[PDB]
Design a protein around this nucleic acid. Structure first.
Lengths: 17, 386, 62, 108, 183
RNA sequence: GUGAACAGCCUCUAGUUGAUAGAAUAAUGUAGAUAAGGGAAGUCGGCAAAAUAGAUCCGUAACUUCGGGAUAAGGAUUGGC
RNA sequence: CGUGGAGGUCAGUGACGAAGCCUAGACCGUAAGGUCGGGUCGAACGGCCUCUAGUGCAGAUCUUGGUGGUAGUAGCAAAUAUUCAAAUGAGAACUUUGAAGACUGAAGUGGGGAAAGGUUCCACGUCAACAGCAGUUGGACGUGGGUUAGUCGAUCCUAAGA
RNA sequence: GAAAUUGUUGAAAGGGAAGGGCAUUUGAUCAGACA
């Protein structure tokens, strides 16, 4: 069977602020 | 916002689209203006490009620093055997353009000109103008009634001429066919001249003179799909560019929200139809003349062909026209020469040229000798000599 | 004919590597019947399996 | 349609000019099969093992500029062979394989 | 033993079929459509030439992003290919169909492919491994194939309806008038 | 074997010849290169690449916790018989 | 109006075909829906008067299962490299044999072991599935054979510790 | 043995979407008063 997990997390940078 | 530093655009918008030409012949869009006063004569010619060589001559240009001094210039030779006239076509002026009205062919057409009407000659019955030739019959009423209509109605008369390919060294056996406009004389004299010249040849010396200025039309050398940097000369991106650096960075703004025709994009480079202008003739040689390459100041019996033959062409054995510089096209290709469309009175146009020496060292390398007799004198006997 | 096991046994019996053992290409049907180390030891005598010579490494230039 | 044998010379320089080094000897094999077809009209061409050694004598990228060959057109004895005839190429042992022109070899 | 829609006389046909065959369904459909309606002799020379690479199968529906070729000209198409593996299967079933026809006594010359169809079969499934430890599928696509060959015939239609005309009273008065004026 | 060297390169004993293939050689790529004249004018920044390099002989500054700096810097030689 | 079930009745329907499904075939109702013809099928279902409720779906990044367009598309491009002949076979670029050219290059692509796996070891038969191409080959599938100790280990002693 | 999705056969339409509402022309298909 196929176990699954959180795909990527992080590596999305940051925005506006 | 506005671009920070200005600069001219890359490329010319008058030469769009940059696509392959429809035919290997570049077509003569415009012929010289007519005046009925002079004699009948052709306005263009057909030839085959051969190669290039070098010329040394004096300069007759009062005022310039090099007046009465030697100068070395480049020239390109065009193999031009005589052309054969095989028909006449008449054009009427209509409110929505010119329009052909009749084509009258000759009786006997050579094999190499009727190869132009077959794709698979080797398995054909050679049925071409077979029924048309039975029109001359015993009287020729049909043919002479057709010519009557051209004299009556046509305002522009042209002539169909096919080049004698078999004489040139090309492996091709099919002969080109193109239309040349007749200038000079009444509409009556024009169609008579064509009829007398059916199956007859027209040599190059009867069209061009030595110091004329002419225009060349031919299809340029092809290269295939090409990137932006060598199709439009765009700047290259810095070294540290992800996803390539031979690309145009910005291909437009957010709005209009469509890529504009003015942007540089990759695609076909080469194989276009071009019309260069203002080329001065330097020699009108004769095929059956030895010492085609000699001059008043040289005086050595040698022909125009370098040692070992023009690379990728062969040897010249017919008439030829050498012009100052480059003409569009690559070697071996059909090239059509035209008379200029205006009277050029500049000093360059009127200058008369007398050559001093034509080059014949081999173009297949760093040639050192001009004649095989010159090689033997310098080197002396070798082992392979008797 | 699949004579892979015959090379293996031949190498140990003749006492060399598999790169140094020769099997006669015209005696396939004979070698195929040799499933014992006795049989391989009898073909070596016959000449159906021969020991290839060692490649030369001459010390002359040295 | 006839049993005929002949001797040729093949200029392998002009056929391997520009070819990648790891593919010079293999491609020469293919060109001797193309050459035998052009002259004998047999789709089935069998190269002798001794010819294979002549080609591969100097590694992948050491093919000889010219090779003298013997092409023999023969009959197919095999049942249900697609083609009645087939060719067979062998090497010819000579000091220098240049300066020679094609010539027929008599059966006996 | 039940086939698809057909309209030919069963007494003059012989059929063959094969099921659960591991060959691409998209390729095999193009192969079958190219033989549809041909005479049996012509189709079998045609397929042999596709293997020999002299002719090509015109690709019509399953043809997105494939290459162009000069051998689609005759079929009116610019994209075509040479499905080797799918030609062998269709080639095998035509041979079976010819064998059945001679068992029934049909005349081997008039046969033609009056029916051929391909539809999907249960998948065969596997696993592929992707970056970041993700599993996906790597399935196949088998196909069912069937066909029928029939004797050609010559039309013998006849005995059609007369289509009697029903005249009104006003019309019959006119027609009677025309008769009296002239014969 | 070469050499200071279980560096790099070639070979002997032994072991593999395993990684989907055939055909052409477009643009854009990844990896490896070379460029006339100028020589950092590029860039936030000599980022990247280049130039130096082994061994023998000569010569080696400021400063110094007197041990170092130091392979400073700068030159010359090198094959075969 | 429609659904599962319950009490009464129609002495209701049915293996001479109940329920279910399909039908640009028909009729009734504004509608929710009811009714009939045909084809498929094979065993139990409905009208009317009442009772009762786990009682009606287009959505919830809804739950489980099945299937598409993308699409015969992206792609199967690291580790220098393959080639000629015969044999076997329905079939050979990939198996077996022979000849050739190459590589690991003795801190190896060699020769053994420790932890860990558990029969993968060897033979015979064999190719539906697995070896992201192929296969006659295989660490695959079916069936069997195989691991011999007074001396090599465990066992015995003690270390941190229990 | 339903639906999604799919092959063949038959009918029809197709200038940068398809689908729907009112009305009729054309093609196909259905019922009948009937005595």
């Amino acid at each position: 069977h196929h176990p699954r997990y959180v795909v990527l997390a992080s590596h999305l940078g940051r925005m506006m602020m | 916002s506005h671009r920070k530093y200005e600069a001219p655009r890359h490329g010319h918008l008058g030469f769009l689209p940059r696509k392959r030409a429809a035919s290997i012949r570049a077509r003569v869009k415009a012929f010289p203006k007519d005046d009925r006063s002079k004699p009948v004569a052709l306005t263009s010619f057909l030839g085959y490009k051969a190669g290039m060589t070098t010329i040394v001559r004096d300069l007759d240009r009062p005022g310039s620093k090099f007046h009465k001094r030697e100068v070395v210039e480049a020239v390109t030779v065009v193999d031009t055997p005589p052309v054969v006239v095989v028909g006449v076509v008449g054009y009427v002026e209509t409110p929505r353009g010119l329009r052909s009205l009749t084509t009258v062919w000759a009786e006997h057409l050579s094999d190499e000109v009727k190869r132009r009407f077959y794709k698979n000659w080797y398995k054909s019955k050679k049925k071409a103008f077979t029924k048309y030739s039975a029109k001359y019959a015993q009287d020729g009423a049909g043919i002479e009634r057709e010519l009557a209509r051209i004299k009556k109605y046509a305002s522009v008369v042209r002539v169909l001429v096919h080049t004698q390919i078999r004489k040139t060294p090309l492996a091709q056996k099919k002969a080109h066919l193109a239309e040349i406009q007749l200038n000079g004389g009444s509409i009556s004299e024009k169609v008579d001249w064509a009829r007398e010249h059916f199956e007859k040849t027209v040599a190059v010396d009867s069209v061009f003179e030595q110091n004329e200025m002419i225009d060349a039309i031919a299809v340029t050398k092809g290269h295939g799909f090409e990137g932006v940097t060598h199709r439009w000369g765009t700047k290259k991106l810095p070294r540290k560019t992800h996803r390539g650096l031979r690309k145009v960075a910005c291909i437009g703004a957010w709005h209009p929200a469509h890529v504009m025709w003015s942007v540089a994009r990759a695609g076909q480079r080469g194989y276009h139809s071009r019309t260069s202008i203002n080329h001065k003739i330097y020699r009108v040689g004769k095929g059956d003349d030895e010492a085609n390459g000699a001059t008043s100041f040289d005086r050595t019996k040698k022909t125009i062909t370098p040692m070992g033959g023009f690379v990728h062409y062969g040897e010249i054995k017919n008439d030829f026209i050498m012009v100052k510089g480059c003409i569009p096209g690559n070697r071996k290709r059909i090239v059509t020469l035209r008379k200029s469309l205006y009277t050029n009175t500049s000093r360059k146009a009127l200058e008369e040229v007398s050559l001093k020496w034509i080059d014949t060292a081999s173009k297949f390398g760093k040639g050192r000798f001009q004649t095989p007799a010159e090689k033997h004198a310098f080197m002396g006997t070798l082992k392979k000599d008797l | 004919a699949n004579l892979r096991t015959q090379k293996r046994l031949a190498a140990s019996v003749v006492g060399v590597g598999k790169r140094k053992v020769w099997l006669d290409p015209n005696e396939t049907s004979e070698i195929a019947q040799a499933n014992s180390r006795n049989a391989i030891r009898k073909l070596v005598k016959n000449g159906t399996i021969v020991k290839k010579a060692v490649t030369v490494h001459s010390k002359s230039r040295t | 349609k006839d049993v005929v044998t002949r001797e040729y010379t093949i200029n392998l320089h002009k056929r391997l000019h520009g070819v990648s080094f790891k593919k010079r000897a293999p491609r020469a094999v293919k060109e001797i099969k193309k050459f035998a077809k052009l002259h004998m009209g047999t789709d089935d061409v069998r190269l002798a093992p001794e010819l294979n050694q002549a080609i591969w004598k100097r590694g992948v990228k050491g093919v000889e500029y010219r090779l003298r060959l013997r092409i023999s057109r023969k009959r197919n004895e095999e049942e249900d062979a697609k083609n009645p005839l087939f060719s067979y190429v062998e090497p010819v042992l000579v000091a220098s394989a240049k300066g020679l022109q094609t010539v027929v070899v008599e059966e006996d | 033993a039940r086939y698809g829609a057909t309209s030919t006389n069963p007494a003059k046909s012989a059929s063959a079929r094969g099921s659960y065959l591991r060959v691409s369904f998209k390729n095999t459909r193009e192969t079958a459509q190219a033989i549809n309606g041909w005479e049996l002799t012509k189709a079998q020379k045609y397929l042999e030439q596709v293997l020999d690479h002299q002719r090509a199968i015109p690709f019509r529906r399953f043809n997105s992003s494939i290459g162009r070729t000069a051998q689609g000209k005759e079929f009116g198409v610019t994209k075509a290919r040479w499905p080797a593996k799918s030609v062998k299967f269709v080639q095998g079933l035509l041979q079976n169909a010819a064998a059945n026809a001679e068992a029934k006594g049909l005349d081997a010359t008039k046969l033609y492919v009056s029916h051929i169809q391909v539809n999907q079969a249960p998948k065969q499934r596997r696993r592929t491994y992707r970056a970041h430890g993700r599993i996906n599928k790597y399935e196949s696509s088998p196909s069912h194939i069937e066909l029928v060959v029939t004797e050609k015939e010559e039309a013998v239609a006849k005995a059609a309806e007369k289509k009697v005309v029903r005249l009104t009273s006003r019309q019959r008065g006119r027609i009677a008038a025309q008769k009296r004026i002239a014969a």
